[PDB]
Amino acid sequence: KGAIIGLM
Amino acid sequence: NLYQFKNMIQCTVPSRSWADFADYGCYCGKGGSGTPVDDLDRCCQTHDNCYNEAENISGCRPYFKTYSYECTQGTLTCKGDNNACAASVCDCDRLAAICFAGAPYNDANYNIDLKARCN
Ligand SMILES: [Ca+2]
């Protein structure tokens, strides 16, 4: 991916 | 890892871009606080807590850990070659993708103001 994102 | 979770969502919710789930409610994506706003947000809160638990395993980073899984003919499976970190994160993800497929999606709950609404 690199970038993000969700969730936690 | 997040790329694999994105693919689990594509495999369980084909009629919707995964970005729909990236910024929803108080827990889906960035958010991790306050009262979940609906069923789909509840899926996302359990997923977030799941990651927090997995992070207690030494060296286990849920956003980055690559695990082994398959998505075929409507069935999503975490495979048996996963170590304890990979198995746990793989289960967190799979559990959340199945949850998202059963939850209603409410346009009004996309990209809400987390600072005002998620205290
Ligand atoms: Ca989150």
Side-chain angles (χ1 to χ4, degrees):
Chain A
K1 205 54 184 166
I4 14 247
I5 335 63
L7 274 58
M8 267 161 155
Chain B
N1 68 34
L2 288 192
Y3 171 75
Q4 298 177 300
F5 185 43
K6 165 207 160 200
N7 280 269
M8 289 192 178
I9 295 159
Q10 291 180 156
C11 166
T12 63
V13 187
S15 64
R16 275 203 187 253
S17 175
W18 64 269
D20 289 359
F21 301 98
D23 184 1
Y24 184 104
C26 288
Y27 287 90
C28 295
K30 206 185 188 146
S33 76
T35 309
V37 302
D38 68 6
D39 283 287
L40 177 60
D41 215 14
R42 290 190 172 276
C43 292
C44 289
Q45 182 189 39
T46 288
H47 186 249
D48 295 342
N49 287 4
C50 201
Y51 274 17
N52 280 347
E53 287 288 326
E55 274 151 36
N56 290 356
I57 301 163
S58 175
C60 196
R61 306 172 279 263
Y63 261 39
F64 300 100
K65 176 77 184 163
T66 292
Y67 43 75
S68 179
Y69 74 106
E70 164 162 4
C71 233
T72 294
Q73 291 184 174
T75 286
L76 185 51
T77 300
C78 294
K79 289 188 178 178
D81 45 339
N82 288 313
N83 70 13
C85 180
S88 291
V89 173
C90 189
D91 234 52
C92 298
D93 283 3
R94 178 175 140 267
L95 317 192
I98 289 163
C99 199
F100 289 4
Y105 189 102
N106 175 350
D107 293 321
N109 280 157
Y110 183 77
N111 180 221
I112 59 164
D113 184 345
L114 302 184
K115 295 175 210 206
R117 291 176 70 190
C118 303
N119 304 310

